Amino acid sequence: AGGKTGQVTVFWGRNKAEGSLREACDSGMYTMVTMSFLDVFGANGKYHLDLSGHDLSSVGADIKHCQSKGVPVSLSIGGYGTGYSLPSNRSALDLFDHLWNSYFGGSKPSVPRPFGDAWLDGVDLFLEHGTPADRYDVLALELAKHNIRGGPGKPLHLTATVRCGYPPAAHVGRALATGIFERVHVRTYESDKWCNQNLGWEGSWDKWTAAYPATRFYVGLTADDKSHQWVHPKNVYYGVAPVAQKKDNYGGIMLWDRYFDKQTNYSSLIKYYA
Amino acid sequence: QSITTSQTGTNNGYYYSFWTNGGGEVTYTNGDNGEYSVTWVDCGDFTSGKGWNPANAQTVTYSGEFNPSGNAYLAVYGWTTDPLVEYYILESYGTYNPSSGLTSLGQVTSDGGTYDIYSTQRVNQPSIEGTSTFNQYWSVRTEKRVGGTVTTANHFAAWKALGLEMGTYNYMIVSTEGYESSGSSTITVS
Numbered sequence A: 001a002g003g004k005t006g007q008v009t010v011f012w013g014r015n016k017a018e019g020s021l022r023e024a025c026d027s028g029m030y031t032m033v034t035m036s037f038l039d040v041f042g043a044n045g046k047y048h049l050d051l052s053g054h055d056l057s058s059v060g061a062d063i064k065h066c067q068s069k070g071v072p073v074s075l076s077i078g079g080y081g082t083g084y085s086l087p088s089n090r091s092a093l094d095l096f097d098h099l100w101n102s103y104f105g106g107s108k109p110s111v112p113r114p115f116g117d118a119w120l121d122g123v124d125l126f127l128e129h130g131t132p133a134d135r136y137d138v139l140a141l142e143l144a145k146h147n148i149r150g151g152p153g154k155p156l157h158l159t160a161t162v163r164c165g166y167p168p169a170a171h172v173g174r175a176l177a178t179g180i181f182e183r184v185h186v187r188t189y190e191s192d193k194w195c196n197q198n199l200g201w202e203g204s205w206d207k208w209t210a211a212y213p214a215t216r217f218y219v220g221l222t223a224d225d226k227s228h229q230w231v232h233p234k235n236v237y238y239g240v241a242p243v244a245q246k247k248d249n250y251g252g253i254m255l256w257d258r259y260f261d262k263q264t265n266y267s268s269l270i271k272y273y274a
Numbered sequence B: 001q002s003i004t005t006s007q008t009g010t011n012n013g014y015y016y017s018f019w020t021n022g023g024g025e026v027t028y029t030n031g032d033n034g035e036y037s038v039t040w041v042d043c044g045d046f047t048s049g050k051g052w053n054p055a056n057a058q059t060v061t062y063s064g065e066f067n068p069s070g071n072a073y074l075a076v077y078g079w080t081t082d083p084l085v086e087y088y089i090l091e092s093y094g095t096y097n098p099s100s101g102l103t104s105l106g107q108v109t110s111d112g113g114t115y116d117i118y119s120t121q122r123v124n125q126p127s128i129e130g131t132s133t134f135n136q137y138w139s140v141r142t143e144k145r146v147g148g149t150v151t152t153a154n155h156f157a158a159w160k161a162l163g164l165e166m167g168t169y170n171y172m173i174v175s176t177e178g179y180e181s182s183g184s185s186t187i188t189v190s
């Protein structure tokens, strides 16, 4: 069966007033912070990082300070907009290159590094919008070549943040079929009919976990207490976490997000149940 | 001059690998003629040491001090490729046997003193080649020692005698490895 992992991933970047990346990390409430989002990328040199007017000139030192304290940091790409696509293999390698030379281990004169010498610990795929022509499989396999242990590099935690619905959209399914996704956060907190905490998530959870046995699965919850998909901490301890911990490839809990977590200290109670 | 993030190279005709996942403060330093030194404080995971890169089954002559305060390993450590393998010939360890809850297996005699054999699958884990699924073998010692001889030809041939394939050698060092601990270690290979 295999249960508690003590792992809590929290998203960050969706509102400046949620406080810095270093403040998140020093809360001692999260084992991984996923910055959010690289909301533009495609068949051109156009890339954009949206951190919602967040203090950019803090995050680089905070990444390193996070890593020292045992909290790795990844960057999620995509989001809820339609300003991104990856419609070719060449589009995917350009994405890798940009990611790599901007935020990871690469260094090229013609490519700036917003976070200085800080070197990120992973990439997340938040792919609300896409088509079957997308080549996130190409991105994923290249990223996986840089998930390094015992050599000149560091671990890269490759993940996908997906809608509750199984089976996933083609562009997500195509990437996941590479087999080398470390973790998948299933989001159970959206207003999606037939697939959220109020109705459908246990069934979605059953199929997801079975389809990718080599991948860890995080149950994705909202920390906004005013959402109808919010689950009281009591019911997490008693219902959500036990159910999800039935499956062998349970990895932990994902929380959307740091802004709403500061509003209700959801993780305080939740971290003991993860 | 000391380093603090992952890197490889050559130092006085020895291959050196130092890897860390970034956790804590791990400081690596190369000395002369096969020595290296690591001091660490609340690390996450790191490996470190000297050896040979395109490495034969070398007859390893090591010596020094290995003083973990917590969990750490001091093994003749290496990888193969095709198939991918990670092997440990564990000489000593800190506060935790790395074979904690593995189906007990053994054993093999070598260089005076005996060892123990284990095997276990790593699935979608980081490695020298990236995200992979491979076995990690062990040669644990039921008595700890820090210094002596480990003729790697005997450990390799004993695993292959039973049901565990190897592959082409890529690197083999005497690894000091910390896991969520502090400590210090100064090992010298020859």
Ligand SMILES: *[C@@H]1O[C@H](CO)[C@@H](O)[C@H](O)[C@H]1NC(C)=O
Pocket (backbone or CB within 6 Å): A262, A263, A264, A265
């Ligand atoms: C959450 O807890 C922190 C300290 O852990 C405190 O500073 C903050 O005011 C709390 N906020 C809420 C919503 O309880």
Ligand SMILES: *[C@H]1O[C@H](CO)[C@@H](O)[C@H](O)[C@H]1NC(C)=O
Pocket (backbone or CB within 6 Å): A089, A090, A093, A138
């Ligand atoms: C993608 O296309 C590139 C050319 O840019 C090619 O070299 C590479 O092997 C392809 N990757 C895969 C395996 O789809």
